[PDB]
Design a protein around this ligand. Structure first.
Ligand SMILES: Nc1ncnc2c1ncn2[C@@H]1O[C@H](COP(=O)(O)OP(=O)(O)OP(=O)(O)O)[C@@H](O)[C@H]1O
Ligand SMILES: [Ca+2]
Ligand SMILES: [Mg+2]
Lengths: 363, 128
């Protein structure tokens, strides 16, 4: 029996088959409906047809906010992306840390009642990333579309009282790159233009080890400047914007936020945990998610955490090349284990107990 | 839980008496290592080691070590970590978990192998 794994991101859904090393389908978590006056489109097709559709993003900060739209995404995922009949497959779904109780139940109700899944399971994204790195203890800094989570985990279980979040992630960095590129005189405002800004962010941005020193270097020469060719053929020049953009992760004040940067958030989560486990958290800081993909980010996290921690504390940042997909891969391994069959919620169990069984089977 | 109980045959065997038990991750399963091969680790593989010690009142002390070869694949190291959590849960959370990386193993782990553990190249193919 072949299990499916679906990682429900706020910006991008990752879906595929347990036992594969990568998701088969990666597509925007978007539902489009006729703009004025097929009833709906999902994913790439919705995005491409945006000229005639109004687009909705049913997941915000990793939390589902519109269940009708989420159900459309899942229907599309099964029937169009994976080309499966969901009544034939156990399904592992992921959830944000601290996903509300009612939401976990609703996910469960939809899978069994709408899709007739024979079995399902819900796993916390950060925990799957930790497992994917081959660890049972560590702190995961999971940064994707709209939120960055810091999730301490001990001997396989998240410590809910110590989970924190910074309300800044990739979409905010894209918006910020858009804003700072206006200083140079480049106006990017449309959807296709925002996609160009996202590409500039993904291809040319980096995290400065020493931000002040980098700004000095940028101001004193053209050493750090880079050329970028627009789709029309025009060539633009990017300078300190390359590292100012992801600097916002460490200095949220760049976005007018009062919140502590990601390094401090990580430290604060560690300090909320039992003193006896903190060594193991500092020694196992795992970066996960698309927004952790900036070159230089692991070196910078190491520098910043080293400054916050006692000098004799060993800091280790683990930043796997595959970390955009760590959550999905962790799910693929978990759902493949010979012991998995004993862990899922079965249809029979759901029929007897209802949605609340999720709190007893998945934690 | 609910309608299911732990049924994996190797879990049923785990930690019943004082001693050392070693399993190798093989294509998403936990497979016992022949006892005459204990201490000979494939650097391309991941393993789960349970050391059971008898305490004074007769209860059992557990240390679970998951050993990760320099060349083991992501499915193997991930599975070794998850099986470790699962075995600890099965053992009522009584086990201390230890991540053991080839060449950086704890003194405790190394001490399990009276004549010294050995490394050998190769191993079972990835389940990916
Ligand atoms: N190489 C890269 N460098 C910087 N940012 C990147 C890179 N690749 C992807 N990103 C950013 O990662 C973000 C998407 O990350 P991810 O897919 O982990 O989020 P998600 O799963 O959609 O959302 P969430 O987990 O927050 O619900 C986007 O903002 C994207 O631009
Ligand atoms: Ca192997
Ligand atoms: Mg995500």
């Amino acid at each position: 029996v072949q299990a499916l794994v679906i990682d429900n991101g706020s910006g991008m859904c990752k879906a595929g088959f347990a036992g594969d090393d990568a998701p088969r389908a990666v597509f925007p978590s978007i539902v489009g409906r006729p703009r004025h006056t097929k009833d709906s489109y999902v994913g790439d097709e919705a995005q491409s047809k945006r000229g005639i559709l109004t687009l909705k993003y049913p997941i915000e900060h990793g939390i589902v906010t519109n269940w009708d739209d989420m159900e459309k995404i899942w229907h599309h995922t099964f029937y169009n992306e994976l080309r499966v009949a969901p009544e034939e497959h156990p399904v592992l779904l992921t959830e944000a840390p601290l996903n509300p109780k009612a939401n976990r139940e609703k996910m469960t109700q939809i899978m069994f009642e709408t899709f007739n899944t024979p079995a399902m399971y819900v796993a916390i994204q950060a925990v799957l990333s930790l497992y994917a790195s081959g660890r049972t203890t560590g702190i995961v800094m999971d940064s994707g579309d709209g939120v960055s989570h810091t999730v301490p985990i001990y001997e396989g279980y998240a410590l809910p009282h110590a989970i924190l979040r910074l309300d800044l992630a990739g979409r905010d960095l894209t918006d910020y790159m858009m804003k700072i590129l206006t200083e140079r005189g480049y106006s990017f405002t449309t959807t296709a233009e925002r996609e160009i800004v996202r590409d500039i962010k993904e291809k040319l941005a980096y995290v400065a080890l020493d931000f002040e020193a980098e700004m000095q270097t940028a101001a004193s020469s053209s050493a750090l400047e880079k050329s970028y060719e627009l789709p029309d053929g025009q060539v633009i020049t990017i300078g300190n914007e390359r590292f100012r953009c992801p600097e916002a992760l460490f200095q949220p004040s760049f976005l007018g936020m009062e919140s502590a940067g990601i390094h401090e958030t990580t430290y604060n989560s560690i300090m909320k945990c039992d003193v006896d486990i903190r060594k193991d958290l500092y020694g196992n800081v795992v970066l996960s998610g698309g927004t952790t993909m900036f070159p230089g980010i692991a070196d910078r996290m190491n520098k910043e955490l080293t400054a916050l921690a006692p000098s004799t504390m060993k800091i280790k940042i683990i930043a796997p090349p595959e970390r955009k997909y760590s959550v999905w891969i962790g799910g693929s391994i978990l759902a493949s284990l010979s012991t998995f069959q004993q862990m899922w919620i079965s249809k029979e169990e759901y029929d007897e107990s209802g949605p609340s069984i999720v709190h007893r089977k998945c934690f | 839980a609910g309608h299911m109980v732990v049924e994996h045959p190797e879990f049923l065997k785990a930690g019943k008496e004082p001693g050392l038990q070693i399993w190798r991750v093989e294509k998403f399963d936990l497979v016992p290592v022949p006892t005459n091969l204990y201490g000979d680790f494939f650097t391309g593989d991941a393993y789960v080691i349970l050391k059971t010690v008898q305490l004074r009142n007769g209860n059992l002390q557990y240390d679970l070590h998951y050993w990760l070869g320099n060349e083991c694949s992501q499915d193997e190291s991930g599975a070794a970590a998850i099986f470790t959590v699962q075995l600890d849960d099965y053992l009522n959370g009584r086990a201390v978990q230890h991540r053991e990386v080839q060449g950086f193993e704890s003194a405790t782990f190394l001490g399990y192998f009276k004549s010294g553990l050995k490394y050998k190249k190769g191993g079972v193919a990835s389940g990916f």
